[PDB]
Ligand binder design. Structure first.
Ligand SMILES: [Cl-]
Ligand SMILES: [Cl-]
Ligand SMILES: [Cl-]
Ligand SMILES: [Cl-]
Lengths: 208, 207
């Protein structure tokens, strides 16, 4: 089962500028080429919309609510989305470098061809979340609660999976040269022989 | 090379003998003696060599063995439960099903022995070396050990539950599979092929 895509019509009216205010709702448009760096805005609602080349770089968005939205080629580098809510959201070709989603709720979300090195999902709750062709080097998947999590064609090198169940995940279609994990949460992970050898070494086997 | 002193017409020969409770066999070369199906308590073998002794199917309560060479002896299906072994070498012995459960083995060597089904369950090892010894379906569970070495042994289907594998080297041995405790695995040295087995036994689903 794949995440549901955002519920969008074929045609949405185009806007090339927007303003952010606390409790503001941005909805029902295609928002294109907007550069709003270093903002701090509470209780934002983005819904039923597409954002194309939006930058919120170094933004801080408390109690963020996002539903039925596709973000395309957006810059969210270092953004704080602590305890955010994301439902039927796609991040496509987005810069998520250092983006902080700690404590967020993600349901029916897709990350496709994103740069997400150092991104944090610490304590996140996932339900139908798919990472596809997304770079996740030194990312944080610490104590994540999840159902129907899929990762394919992702670079997971040095990602942190401590306190997160790996039972029923398939890392065989991803790459990692290093991985941090909890030994008691390892059983049931699907891997290649090369990955198995790495994991066995990480568990303390001395392999010739 | 050993870190302890080696074992020494050097000894007078005996080619027959009888066993009785509390018997002490010492200071002889005992050779070609067939004594199967014995049940003898507090037997002592010491300062002696036994060449082609059979004790097949023997039952020995509180066996005590010290400074002894066993060469080409048959101990198949012997029970030496809670035995005491100090400075003992087993060379080309048949140890099929031999039961050492709960024994103490200090400075012992098993060289080129056939030891299918042999049990060391609950044993305590203190300087014990297995070399070129077949240990298929053997028991090594709940074993406490210091200076245990195994080399060129077949460990297929041996059982190591609740025995620490930290500091052991199985890479110089072979096994198709074996049973172990996950929490006792760290620090074992293995080949990649062995590691793949162990990884799958830990529940990794390997493509
Ligand atoms: Cl989409
Ligand atoms: Cl890999
Ligand atoms: Cl060893
Ligand atoms: Cl265990």
């Amino acid at each position: 089962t794949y995440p549901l895509p955002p519920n969008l019509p074929e045609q949405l009216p185009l806007l090339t500028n927007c303003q952010l205010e606390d409790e503001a709702i941005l909805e029902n448009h295609l928002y294109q080429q907007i550069d709003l760096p270093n903002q701090e805005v509470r209780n934002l609602v983005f819904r039923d919309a597409v954002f194309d080349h939006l930058s919120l770089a170094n933004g801080q968005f408390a109690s963020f609510d996002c539903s039925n939205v596709r973000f395309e080629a957006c810059d969210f580098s270092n953004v704080e989305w602590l305890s955010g809510s994301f439902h039927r959201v796609t991040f496509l070709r987005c810069n998520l470098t250092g983006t902080n989603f700690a404590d967020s709720y993600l349901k029916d979300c897709l990350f496709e061809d994103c740069k997400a090195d150092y991104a944090s999902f610490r304590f996140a709750n996932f339900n139908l979340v798919h990472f596809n062709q997304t770079r996740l080097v030194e990312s944080e998947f610490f104590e994540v609660t999840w159902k129907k999590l899929l990762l394919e064609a992702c670079d997971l090198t040095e990602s942190n999976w401590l306190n997160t169940s790996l039972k029923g995940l398939d890392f065989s279609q991803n790459t990692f040269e290093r991985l941090t994990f909890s030994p008691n949460y390892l059983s049931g992970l699907k891997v290649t022989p090369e990955q198995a050898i790495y994991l066995a070494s990480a568990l303390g086997l001395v392999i010739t």
